[PDB]
Amino acid sequence: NKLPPFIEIYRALIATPSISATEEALDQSNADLITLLADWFKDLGFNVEVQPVPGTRNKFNMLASTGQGAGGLLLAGHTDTVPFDDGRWTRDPFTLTEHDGKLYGLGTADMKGFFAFILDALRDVDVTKLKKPLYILATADEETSMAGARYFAETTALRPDCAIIGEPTSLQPVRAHKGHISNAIRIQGQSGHSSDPARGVNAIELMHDAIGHILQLRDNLKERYHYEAFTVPYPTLNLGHIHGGDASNRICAWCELHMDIRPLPGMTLNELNGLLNDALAPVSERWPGRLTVDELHPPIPGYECPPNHQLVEVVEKLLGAKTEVVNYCTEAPFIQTLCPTLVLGPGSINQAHQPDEYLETRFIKPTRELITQVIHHFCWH
Amino acid sequence: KLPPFIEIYRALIATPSISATEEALDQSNADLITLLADWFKDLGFNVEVQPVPGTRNKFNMLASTGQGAGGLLLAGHTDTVPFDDGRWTRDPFTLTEHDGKLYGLGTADMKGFFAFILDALRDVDVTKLKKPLYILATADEETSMAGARYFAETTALRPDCAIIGEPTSLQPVRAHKGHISNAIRIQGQSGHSSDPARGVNAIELMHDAIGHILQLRDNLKERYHYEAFTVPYPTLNLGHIHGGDASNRICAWCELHMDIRPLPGMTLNELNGLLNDALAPVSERWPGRLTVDELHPPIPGYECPPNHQLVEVVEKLLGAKTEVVNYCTEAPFIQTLCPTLVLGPGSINQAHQPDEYLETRFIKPTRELITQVIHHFCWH
Ligand SMILES: [Zn+2]
Ligand SMILES: [Zn+2]
Ligand SMILES: [Zn+2]
Ligand SMILES: [Zn+2]
Ligand SMILES: [Zn+2]
């Protein structure tokens, strides 16, 4: 079975909905997308394994393999997209449309195009002639939980020489980014009429005490840790949303705060959890049982690719570009547990998750070239 | 799309290209050259076919891709030796597989090498190579080496390195001795044996020359050494002698046929001057009477330096260390252009033999060798 031309591959991927969401009604299975990729890889002569990802709403990972033995190259991407706002799109998000040197569609930039590029570059490559293995990972639920990548990293026996995750980086090689933890702090107070405030426990007052401690943690993070390579050098902590209480004339019976932290590479999740628990401890100990912490998504550590890796040397030379760091988060921390990993892909973060998302056609040739060249270097040598 | 390997090979074997000094058995290699030229053009090479001056309608082919300095030369001859039809048991020009062998004239020596180059190149995109690749196909290796001689005299190409795909069982050969064969001819002056003084006795003059030539033999054995060779010195052989009509006549003429096999590093000019120096007392005593004529075109010894990168690369790919051999190839002429190895599939033991073959076990390792050396010397 011959592989369709690049634009047809791209078009079919965009046309196959794969939105992930916390809300079940918006959370679409990536079964169709995964099978489409899996059979294209099978057609090119890869061994392909599709696995259900435990704990997801019917989502799957795909790993396509050619070759056996140590090392080789892993090319990795996620299959899901974010949802779309049909108020703000002006085209069908599932219809790949070329206009004014741009290819529009949901996931054109983030990040279905990367798979089209891989397949198109492999069009004629005889995988029987490779000397080291080539692996392609397609993951579930990157945009929500990262359960696909986490599950793969937890279970796989593979240890490649190196990996590239094709997130949109404008084909600039990214070697590090911050982590991401997002929590809801929930405080249960006691109701009562405002004519006698002392008679109950006021959840806003307790949340005030808690926020004091959380802001002291924010200050300590910022005072203690700095990596000026990041445009924001410190670990960040953001108070995003707060809600509680019925009415002005009633003791506030509950209050919830949603916050996040973006730790620098090198801080462990265990460390950071300890620092948050320590921060809240004075409140939890004064008011036993009343304060709880929930995660809004599973936590993700920061990451950094080590120096002096062939991957960097080769890619920097191929692109004429030095590695950069970013403040946002990817599956790289999970993949980096397996091998040295870069984040490198076509399209721009500026279009990711946006209405009328697109990928510029100018990325087509340089992306095809990069992929051909890294396969040659890491698999054909 | 090139035809599959076996069809390329069949086509080459099926196209007679026997070379011979006799005009009647000496076949043009034009048809063999045309097959290769058209296939290299199919692959996107620039192809030049040149007549080889002084031959019976023979040609050389050079297929070229890429621009600028260096690169890789792959070289072979297009001719074969003749066949003895009483000793063959299949048609020499019909490539036939039997029990892991491919039988036919030139299977081992050395048409297979071209089939392997074309087959290795079938999917290779030459437009992507960063340094040039050249394929040379020569005339008349098995007689005069006119093809290789002419190419080496005329080309401006200076590759980084070259391989000549003679059958070496895919073991790299980095040196061999030369070969010069001369007739020493002495003109005497006849007369009746009852009065020797009235003539000039060519056997007596030849006796003086032989003494000088055996002294040269002794000098060559004493003063030049190359340990790797089974006979580690330059050899000199007196093979044939003939002169005179009768016991009762002064011997009016005498001829001696001899050969010398010099070591790598001795030039033909150096060797010629040693021989001329040895003969000088005789030619000076008897001006006009002694001449030296070549019996075949002289071949210098050859070597590639053992530490060259081409040696390192091939020794690792093949798991076989470099060797030296006692017989001749075109390597001395190609070595004038660039460091050169002799390395190819099939065995020397099948070369020029009845029911010549190349074993099929050579197919996969030869394809891989060619692919790897093109990659190493041309790709980046
Ligand atoms: Zn993404
Ligand atoms: Zn995203
Ligand atoms: Zn290479
Ligand atoms: Zn030969
Ligand atoms: Zn021969």
Numbering used by the authors:
A (entry chain B): 3 to 383
B (entry chain A): 4 to 383
Sentences from the paper on this structure:
ArgE is a metallohydrolase in the arginine biosynthetic pathway that hydrolyzes N α-acetyl-L-ornithine to form acetate and L-ornithine. The first critical step in bacteria is the acetylation of glutamate to form N-acetyl glutamate, and the second critical and unique step is the deacetylation of N α-acetyl-L-ornithine (NAO) by ArgE to form L-ornithine. Therefore ArgE is required for cell viability, making it an attractive antibiotic target.
The two structures show a dimeric protein present in the crystals which is likely to be the biologically active form, analogous to published data on the DapE protein (Nocek al., 2014). The protein monomers consist of two catalytic domains (residues 1–179 and 305–383) and a dimerization domain (residues 180–304), with a small hinge region connecting them. The zinc-binding sites are located on the surface of the catalytic domain within the crescent-shaped substrate-binding cavity, and the zincs are coordinated by H80, E169, D112, E145 and H355 residues. The occupancy of the second zinc ion in the di-zinc structure was less than 100% and was estimated to be 80% based on visual inspection of the difference maps and refinement of metal positions. The Tris molecule directly interacts with five protein residues (D112, E144, E145, E169, and H355) that are involved in zinc binding and also with both zinc ions. One of the Tris oxygens is positioned between the zinc ions and may stabilize the second zinc ion in the active site. Upon examining the crystallization buffer, the Tris concentration is 100 mM, thus acting as an inhibitor at this concentration. The Zn-Zn distance determined by X-ray crystallography was observed to be 3.38 Å, nearly identical to the Zn-Zn distance of 3.39 Å determined by X-ray absorption spectroscopy.
